[PDB]
Symmetry: D2
Subunit: 339 residues, 4 copies
């Protein structure tokens, strides 16, 4: 089978032939039709994180396709089912985290496109219990970006604890942000879109943002304090010292600041201010199988749509470069099918 | 009436005669019998915080006594009722925070012994709706330290979200910490007491701590991972960079780190770690009227006791001096029973 | 002032002149502009409940108007403010219910138009702390029905615990039902409207219902089990033995059945089924001041609109007549803009 | 292997030899050391429920033993592990109930000792994913009764939502009741024990009950209203019309009445009262794997102990007889090992 593979860190991926994966107990073979490209795939290829991935490595944790064959012991899935393989490739299913609906925290978890081969190929071996079905009226292309970006923003909003009618600030209207705006509105929330590019803010208004503000042209925190009395919660998709400080300052007392990004720096927080204002700082990444199913259901109902650009597997290295230079508006989905 | 008053910041308080306060609509005059001394009183006396208190100033937000008279419009309190005047002297009662049981966050709140005169006197004018009744079988001396330290630790434990059977780490077994240990046990929790002084740890064992560990003689975070698999939450009573670091490292994934202290420095937090581990950093201070009633009830039932040292109002400056030099084990309560 | 008053139970109300109420500490005088007519007013007029109202009695707990004057001690309200006087006229503000955001349960509460005079008059004395401000862009006529029917259905939906994306069944699409449908959609829920009159179901579709079913033409519970797999919760606005049984049968395991109606009969519940299916039966009526402000906000944002019929005070007896014989589609609001 | 089997309903069980179960994918063979006797086993033996069990039938869902062998695909369990097989023999692990930590409600569940053979034998084939490990310092005899009675009361207490410091009423201090008292105390709650036999009430006081009251010698509801102002919740272990009526009347407004019993009669509930008082009626049975692990942990910590009587498998029919006649104080556990 054809596949994009990382043979050495920081070296371009090679599109070559590799063995077609074989399956056994509790697994399924998935023929990949599409796979979203995530910033995490880039860091995997560059091995710039503390816990480095395996090598060689087939990246991709936003791979969607059809079940070609089921292994022994698998009863809930059948040949022909349309599914996706998310970041949480597998969990133990028996630890405290797994038994309490927090499988994403399982210490024994395997991650697709990082510790095990992913969706950047024609075929991918997957753990049957952990793949998630794709709604019937959702195309593979539309579905792919929901497997990480969509579920990630949807879960982050649930983590804020904001109920219908309350206000939330979405910092960064990019790959994750433009989707976060849509989930928030679908969840009965009022949104304040924050971003330095007016192009993005206009896009946010088209997607349902009730208010927009550019940090470069005006004080974002002050704007929200004066306009709505401070938001009930903030979701930071583009984590950086300044963005986090602004968000921390725009939330009303007792509010929550939810971080979704993955930067290598440290964020200073005022102890006096945090305690006195009862502020909460929460980190949130991806989501459980239930969260993802819910995230997909909103898409299937037409409440959420991702701005996508389709590209062939061979152009993966081009995509990574455009990503490093921030020359990507929206999300990129690779197709491994002959369109 | 006699009273300890701050005439100038960083100047010793003067024990002198002052006008006996007059009351009107919605207030009560309280004859103070005792008043706990809180580190906050010291910072007020030195005016070292961004929002400085008024001057002259009668400190004290742990004042307990008897209602001498009630003003017009007050129906729930009567002459002779035993009450206390906490930090939250009064709130508006109409804003979002006040209507959703979060009166401690009201932006229009006034604070006892900071923005209005407090309990370091024979008499104190108080807002009737915000004073709290003291259980019948609880002496003024025992009740005083609950109005701040007690309710603070009790609320902080509720904020962790830890349920009976789960583990919590209490960092710093001092004024607040030795009381936190007791509330945690009364709440069905298992406790790991952390402190650099073995004297304190032995005290914690006597107070109910299930496990103890000295950071100076061993890795606290490692001890908790090995012994219990990480605590479900941590309450930091003595906030400092190293203490917060250790606490952040000893909590299991998805756990909560609750800060209670009020230090003027910044705390760096790992963004990558926080997001990946779903960790929560929450600030908590004092508590609502309901929280305080609940906290007092635990004391009245004999499940919580504060180690205290009684001292006359005249020795307030000596108490402050001993406080600055960490020459105090437990809590100090001032007695007004000597005019 | 002019007012519609009940002098004897079961006797038509008399529209006559009466003393203009005077006010004192903590009260405000409200010039009534409109007042909604609620089934509760009818029962009050007939005194058919265990706890009978005072006599003579000026009914109405859906009165909205302008503050003509404020009494001593009132600072959050100014002459000219637009407010409403709900069923919860006043509470003690110090019992456990009142301190834990459950004021509607206060045993010492006074109710508008039942134990104290209501809005069926040109003027009404009200407790300042318990009136609720009306959003600027909401007309008195539109606001009135929200003060009881609106807040009641909104709170009932919050009580179900249904989150965005889940399914709720609304039994009865009448006075309360048609408004419930709208709040549910504004809360991110999918709705199944249930009613014996196809007219009402077509209305529900226009108001946003996702699915409709007529219990007379088909098994409602079976329909919901087949179409959505059982709703997550049900709100019964027209409580009756058959409606409750149907609702109890259409909810999925672990679901909640919320009762909003006030019938004088008893409802039999299967013990075996309830325990085995982990079903919850909850009663809900009106809402707190916070709940009402939140409910009014949705109306002000254009997400909820009540179908109303405006009638002059003099036609009150006509209205009650048409009420008893179910000759009313939607809600009736009395206008008192005459002398 | 030896086993007690039901060949015909309402016919005495036959202790005879039967085939030793064989295992396959995802199962384990468990050598039974002990098995609790539950009232449910009796109803199974008499097939007096709507959904009748299979026949022949080896009852028992409180079976605890040693894993003698693991089937293919099982990695979380090893030979020698000490485990128990609860009522929830298995669930599908993929429906909404299973994915949201409500496995006990899975419509595809199989139940031990009812739809599949249970622990009333020397061996029992079990679903690997649904057996639960027994704490190291807990004997098989002590552990057995926790697998159903223990977890059922522990979960019911969690369902009440009562927090540390609040009051709960336990109706019926028998098999489940005496254990419920202990869990409630371990959960930081204050308990009112209710039962018609003073013998039981004295037992409850020894087990930690704060207050006791006999419905035959005084009004239980009135006693609780006067003594504590109504309990925050009630757990009815012996469901009957009078017991439920009493419980419903002793709970404070907004409180919860949790039913744990399984009677074949109907319970009438006041609609007017329930809506006005915001009372909740919740059914609760057994618990999830997580709940059971938690319940077992409390036992291992010495906070909960079951009063049990050990008897050999052969005496099962005599145990059932004494059970029908209410001649059993506490719980009975069958031993499969002579000695
Ligand atoms: Zn990703
Ligand atoms: Zn796990
Ligand atoms: Zn306020
Ligand atoms: Zn203090
Ligand atoms: Zn009404
Ligand atoms: Zn009250
Ligand atoms: Zn059982
Ligand atoms: Zn299932």
């Amino acid at each position: 089978m054809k596949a994009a593979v990382v043979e050495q860190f920081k070296e371009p991926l090679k599109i070559k032939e590799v063995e077609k994966p074989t399956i056994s107990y509790g697994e399924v073979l998935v023929r990949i039709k599409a796979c979203g490209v995530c910033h995490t795939d880039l860091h995997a290829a560059h091995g710039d994180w503390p816990v480095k991935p395996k090598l060689p490595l087939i990246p991709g944790h936003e791979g969607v396709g059809i079940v070609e064959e089921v292994g022994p012991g698998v009863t809930h899935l059948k040949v022909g089912d349309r599914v996706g393989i998310p970041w949480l490739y597998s969990a133990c299913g028996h630890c405290d985290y797994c038994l309490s609906g927090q499988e994403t925290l399982c210490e024994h978890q395997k991650n697709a496109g990082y510790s095990v081969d992913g969706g950047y190929a024609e075929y991918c071996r997957a753990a049957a219990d952990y793949v998630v079905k794709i709604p019937d009226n959702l195309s593979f292309e539309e579905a792919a970006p929901i497997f990480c970006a969509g579920v990630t923003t949807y879960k982050a909003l649930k983590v804020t604890g904001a109920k219908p009618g309350e206000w939330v600030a979405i910092y960064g209207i990019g790959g994750l942000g433009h989707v976060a705006v849509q989930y928030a509105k679908a969840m009965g929330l009022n949104v304040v879109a924050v971003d330095i590019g007016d192009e993005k803010l206009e896009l946010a208004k088209e997607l349902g943002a009730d208010l927009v503000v550019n940090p470069l042209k005006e004080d974002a925190a002050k704007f929200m304090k004066e306009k709505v009395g401070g938001v009930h919660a903030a979701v930071v998709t583009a984590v950086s010292k300044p963005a986090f400080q602004s968000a921390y300052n725009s939330i009303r007392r007792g509010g929550a600041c939810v971080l979704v990004g993955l930067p290598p720096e440290e964020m200073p927080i005022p102890i006096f201010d945090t305690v006195l204002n009862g502020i909460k700082i929460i980190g949130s990444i991806v989501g459980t199988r239930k969260d993802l199913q819910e995230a997909l259901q909103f898409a299937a109902e037409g409440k959420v749509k991702t701005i996508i650009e389709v590209q062939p597997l061979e152009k993966i290295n081009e995509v990574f470069d455009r990503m490093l230079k921030g020359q990507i508006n929206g999300r990129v989905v690779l197709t491994l099918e002959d369109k």
